[PDB]
Design a protein around this nucleic acid. Structure first.
Ligand SMILES: [Mg+2]
Ligand SMILES: [Mg+2]
Ligand SMILES: [Mg+2]
Ligand SMILES: [Mg+2]
Ligand SMILES: [Mg+2]
Ligand SMILES: [Mg+2]
Ligand SMILES: [Mg+2]
Ligand SMILES: [Mg+2]
Ligand SMILES: [Mg+2]
Ligand SMILES: [Mg+2]
Ligand SMILES: [Mg+2]
Ligand SMILES: [Mg+2]
Length: 132
RNA sequence: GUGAAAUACCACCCUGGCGCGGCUGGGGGCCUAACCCUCGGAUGGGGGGACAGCGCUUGGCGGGCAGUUUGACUGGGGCGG
């Protein structure tokens, strides 16, 4: 852990829960990268991956453009693009792919479908945030 | 590049571990002051001691007791059927 991270996670809270349009203006500032950042928001998933009847995939494309699947640990990963679009074209876009993801929920998925969501980068720290 | 997986700063997760803390269940030891026993004497001393005893509750063992059941046919009834 370098010092770019020492002022990264000192400037943001994994302690305090946040919302999605509140924390989406902080997405380009908290990446100190030397180049080429791509922003990744993540969610833990409320399904049992050992049951393949609960599995999901497809190709659905973001409104903006470049520039979703469940693994055997039952969590979520997906690229939305390249750094590109600024805070207000992201907070605008930050509700776009999530609600497009909720439409894949298998029936036998027991419990809260999106367990916890931290907005982060490939370059950046943990921020408690709400998909809402 | 002879394994399909890429060996970066990252979160999101699995799996176990310890670390702190929040809620916590469980054990041991010591104490005394409730409670108990005792003390020619006591607003006290000694002994036991949060046990025991007692309340409410759980499940159990339980002829020591209680209420009862223990069929009809039948060349008498039972036995047999
Ligand atoms: Mg003692
Ligand atoms: Mg005394
Ligand atoms: Mg005493
Ligand atoms: Mg007691
Ligand atoms: Mg009996
Ligand atoms: Mg009797
Ligand atoms: Mg009677
Ligand atoms: Mg008879
Ligand atoms: Mg006859
Ligand atoms: Mg006769
Ligand atoms: Mg007879
Ligand atoms: Mg008979």
């Amino acid at each position: 852990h370098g010092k770019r991270y020492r002022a990264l996670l000192e400037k943001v809270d994994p302690n305090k829960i946040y919302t999605i349009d509140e924390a989406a203006h902080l997405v380009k500032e908290l990446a100190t990268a030397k180049f080429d950042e791509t922003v990744e928001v993540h969610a833990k998933l409320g399904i049992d991956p050992r049951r393949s009847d609960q599995n999901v995939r497809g190709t659905v494309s973001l409104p903006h453009g470049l520039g979703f699947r469940n693994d055997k640990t039952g969590a979520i990963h997906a690229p939305v693009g390249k750094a590109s679009f600024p805070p207000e074209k992201l907070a605008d876009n930050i509700r776009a792919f999530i609600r497009a993801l909720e439409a894949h929920k298998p029936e036998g998925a027991k419990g809260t479908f999106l367990r916890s969501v931290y907005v982060t980068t490939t370059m950046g720290p943990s921020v408690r945030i709400n998909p809402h």
